[PDB]
DNA sequence: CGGGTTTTTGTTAAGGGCTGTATCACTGTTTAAGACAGGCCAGATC
DNA sequence: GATCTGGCCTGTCTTACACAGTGATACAGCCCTTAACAAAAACCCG
DNA sequence: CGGGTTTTTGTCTGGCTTCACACTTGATTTGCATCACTGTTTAAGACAGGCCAGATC
DNA sequence: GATCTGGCCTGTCTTACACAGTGATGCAAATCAAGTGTGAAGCCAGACAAAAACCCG
């Protein structure tokens, strides 16, 4: 309810004095019940012990700088940052859902008194937010950016009998209140030095606990958990940055296969994922070393635009959210270009196209009340992307064979969108999946011919991904929509709301508070209560 | 507690599902319990009727523009503004404090069923809070201002037999939560045409209900109320604006006596109070008409600086908040001067000035943790005006006697501060009240002799009001602290909060929501629920 | 008026468990509008 | 050409222009109990 | 070890009890959806020509 | 002289950067409000007779 302590105390004492009873509990009984829900409360132990990681079990909110050298002699740093220790936070996230683990265990007809090697599958994701500053006073202070690194327990399995059974699977994976916060920093997500300064310890802890087993007493008996991390909720820019690629405008487009934007137009769907992390460390080594004594423009070809040391280990994936938003903006542009009738007379001016845009947006907020937006958002993408939109915009272009072509294009795009928009297209839409190959090869066909005034050279990133990589990503990892960044893209509102209503402005405590409240919010032993009206 | 409706409903359904009972009430129950506490619910009857005011009794929140013609052909107005009708507001206030004034008659050994002509004494306060905007997106561009005209039932008094007994007196007169809001608008306080367009109807209503008697059934038996309005919650700026006086930096300084700054410095404390509202209207008539055919520079002597038509009827009084802030800032200036020994070597340059300022700032921050600031608030003025602060700053002057010449000065200013700052100096500090004349006269001598290097010509306005008019404003009104703008100055907080936490962004509903919620917050039938824990 | 009784009450101090409220460290990071007085140029004028 | 006078420009001044609200910590009451000893009306009993 | 002493149960037929509960039908409350409205661009970075300007044969 | 080439200038094109939350309406479902006599689930009757948990020769 985003109440504060003074307001909760007002309500407490008022209900108490009126009713006579004590319906709400006092504040200290909330601090005590809170100590149980943060990390740093339960006893756990690793085996073998974690290399370079402490052994204590009461480690709460650590300073994020990790003892970063802060004097007037080292590289200047003022980015305040708080975090959890990865292992203790993961333990807390598991004993926050002990009850659901046990319930799923019973549901799968398993002996509730079991302690097998529970294989957890976590999905971690960082996403830098912008302009988290405010106006606490008479002044427009400054642009202030933040970065949240967060994770989520995606799926818990056990190796019972001779197989694996889902003891637990996240209901809505990319939701604002199942993405647990792990690190909060106030820094530009492209300030590579400070970013690595903050995130290096977390990657260290992650690499450490990737190779051991966690003993944790869970409701009586102790259980042994094994972890498998999957960094997937990184948007395209953060993938190209952390993994050590060149910026998005390069010749090398796909962060999953090493193909060049040009040759990605002569051949649209015959690629295969070949951009791992080990290979990219190897390619950076070849770059920095240059053992074949090549020129810059030959060494680039040798190492496929890798000119930086891969920092975090991500996995090849496509970010369904930004994939769909980019496709929608792309279609907005193609609608404008169809209005301009460019397929017959090219090379208009830098204002004829603006007039075409005016035509389009007037017609749209006259035939749909679809208000124009200068920043493409998923809402405008859902509203735009319909067969009704070509149904409308057909009456703005003179020829009708363009109606036919664009109608067919929209048909194929909507016929394939669910396969990467769902959260389990193996069962939710298996016909679309088993026909994706054909329904996208013909989409590429019709992009080759009836739009070659655009797709002769440059074909954008997300179209290449959407067309050529989706089926094998599915055959590799189940779905595409679940493994996305929508979860970490919602919590910006929570960040701002907590920093406004529940904080202490001290610039040192003021971040512990946000981190703590967002942790509590995304808890589950509490959502069990706030969802009590569903019996 | 400032809950939304979604949040309140969430808490409601949670408690209902957990407990199983129903402690909180559904939203519709609260809307029904709200329709009773807003104005435009009870029946009332003016006798004789109110000239130019309707007779309906169910008029609540209405467009503040009062049907101001808004076409392309009229003077363009764009200010959103909501208001209550003044009589409806007073009726709701009275049948809100019904229980309290019944208890008052009980305590005063009167009859519950007594229907004497209750004379009410209401305070009027209008304050133009500024910068009430927030950044919705990107761009700090537009600052927007606001104005809230409000009132406060200050005392209620029945004329039992042949004596007036105080059935009710406000405990905290200038408090956050008894200043009932009446009208509020988004417009500069000095956009004089808009301000008059909005406040002309309200003035019409408060002029209508000055020769009538509200008949209102209160706890069964009907009662006859009869009003006295006093406009006092006005900062110097609006006083001068809506009385038809020259801007505050003129030669005619006091809004109570018509005297020149030079003559104020020659004669420090012997003035009377000789500037009413009818006198202002009559002097404006002299101005506009110019009956004696004389040039501007002696006509302005004839009309003592009245060159505009008076708009509202305010009373001759001094604010207290701005009074002590101004006097404290003037002592701060005297300190910056004494550090530099301006008396020995006058006419320095505009670098030693800032040097003196930074000297005093660093010194005070070192000695008292009194971190300096630019906008001098009330906490700064509170801390700075202490005998300890002069005892500290006294260690920065090479002189031997300026020590005592500041010690005595601060001594007398402190002997004077309670006299006006008190909400009833008669029975809180009558010794200060009977010595105030002597203390102010000695203070005046001290400024005139050991500080003539500053107060030879210019003497600021507040060192005229404070010095020469307090011992008569007291004898005319009682206190000075009660009749002040603090109650309104505080409510500004609430506005901003409401405007972001309880509103509809509709730019038409988004203001009546703020106004309704502020009326509720200011109610009393609810404050004696949120104060149940004490009693 | 008493006067044995009830019938209930007043009191002590240590230590703890609990609860309610006050206190604490801390965060804003220059005004804008108008009045008047010089002072110096700048042009009107003898 | 010399001189008298007004206009413009800065420059000082005087009124305003958003700090109470956040979580955490610290006291200050305040009741429960040991065990006994004494104390206001409540009231028949004499 | 299997046999024996606790807690704990079945157990009496009677009369008792509170209270759910039959069976309408409209006047209320309560739940859960809708609804109209709000924000009013880019900012770094890659690649490509193209023009010009200075170098070189 | 004549041309080549390299540097700077825009000029497009790529990924990215803030919309669910406000108070209001408005129908569907629930309940509930009486009627009046029912039976049903326990209550408890002091005292008596077949089982689980553990002592005991
Ligand atoms: Ca991002
Ligand atoms: Ca994001
Ligand atoms: Ca003001
Ligand atoms: Ca104010
Ligand atoms: Zn690819
Ligand atoms: Zn005066």
Curated annotation (Swiss-Prot), chains A, B:
Coiled coil: none annotated. One of its GO terms (cellular component) is nucleus. Changing residue 420 to A: Capable of nicking but defective for hairpinning. Changing residue 234 to A: Deficient in both nicking and hairpin formation. A divalent metal cation binds at residues 127, 235, 489. GO terms for biological process: adaptive immune response; B cell differentiation; chromatin organization; DNA recombination; negative regulation of T cell apoptotic process; negative regulation of thymocyte apoptotic process; positive regulation of T cell differentiation; pre-B cell allelic exclusion. Maturing lymphoid cells and central nervous system. GO terms for molecular function: endonuclease activity; histone binding; identical protein binding; metal ion binding; protein homodimerization activity; sequence-specific DNA binding; ubiquitin protein ligase activity; ubiquitin-protein transferase activity. Changing residue 465 to A: Capable of nicking but defective for hairpinning. Disruption phenotype: Mice display a severe combined immunodeficiency phenotype. The have a small lymphoid organs that do not contain mature B and T-lymphocytes. The arrest of B- and T-cell differentiation occurs at an early stage and correlates with the inability to perform V(D)J recombination. The frequency of homologous immunoglobulin pairing is much lower. No obvious neuroanatomical or behavioral abnormalities have been observed. Binds 1 divalent metal cation per subunit. Mg(2+) or Mn(2+). Keywords: Chromatin regulator, DNA recombination, DNA-binding, Endonuclease, Hydrolase, Isopeptide bond, Metal-binding, Multifunctional enzyme, Nuclease, Nucleus, Transferase, Ubl conjugation, Ubl conjugation pathway, Zinc, Zinc-finger. Autoubiquitinated in the presence of CDC34/UBCH3. Changing residue 319 to N: Impaired cleavage. Its EC number is 3.1.-.-, 2.3.2.27. Changing residue 498 to A/W: Capable of nicking but defective for hairpinning. The record marks 420 as: Essential for DNA hairpin formation, participates in base-stacking interactions near the cleavage site. Changing residue 236 to Q: Impaired cleavage. It catalyses: S-ubiquitinyl-[E2 ubiquitin-conjugating enzyme]-L-cysteine + [acceptor protein]-L-lysine = [E2 ubiquitin-conjugating enzyme]-L-cysteine + N(6)-ubiquitinyl-[acceptor protein]-L-lysine. Changing residue 483 to A: Deficient in both nicking and hairpin formation. Catalytic component of the RAG complex, a multiprotein complex that mediates the DNA cleavage phase during V(D)J recombination. V(D)J recombination assembles a diverse repertoire of immunoglobulin and T-cell receptor genes in developing B and T-lymphocytes through rearrangement of different V (variable), in some cases D (diversity), and J (joining) gene segments. In the RAG complex, RAG1 mediates the DNA-binding to the conserved recombination signal sequences (RSS) and catalyzes the DNA cleavage activities by introducing a double-strand break between the RSS and the adjacent coding segment. Belongs to the RAG1 family. Homodimer. Component of the RAG complex composed of core components RAG1 and RAG2, and associated component HMGB1 or HMGB2. Interacts with DCAF1, leading to recruitment of the CUL4A-RBX1-DDB1-DCAF1/VPRBP complex to ubiquitinate proteins and limit error-prone repair during V(D)J recombination. The RING-type zinc finger mediates the E3 ubiquitin-protein ligase activity. The NBD (nonamer binding) DNA-binding domain mediates the specific binding to the nonamer RSS motif by forming a tightly interwoven homodimer that binds and synapses 2 nonamer elements, with each NBD making contact with both DNA molecules. Each RSS is composed of well-conserved heptamer (consensus 5'-CACAGTG-3') and nonamer (consensus 5'-ACAAAAACC-3') sequences separated by a spacer of either 12 bp or 23 bp. This is V(D)J recombination-activating protein 1. The chain holds residues 474 to 1008 of 1040 of the full protein.
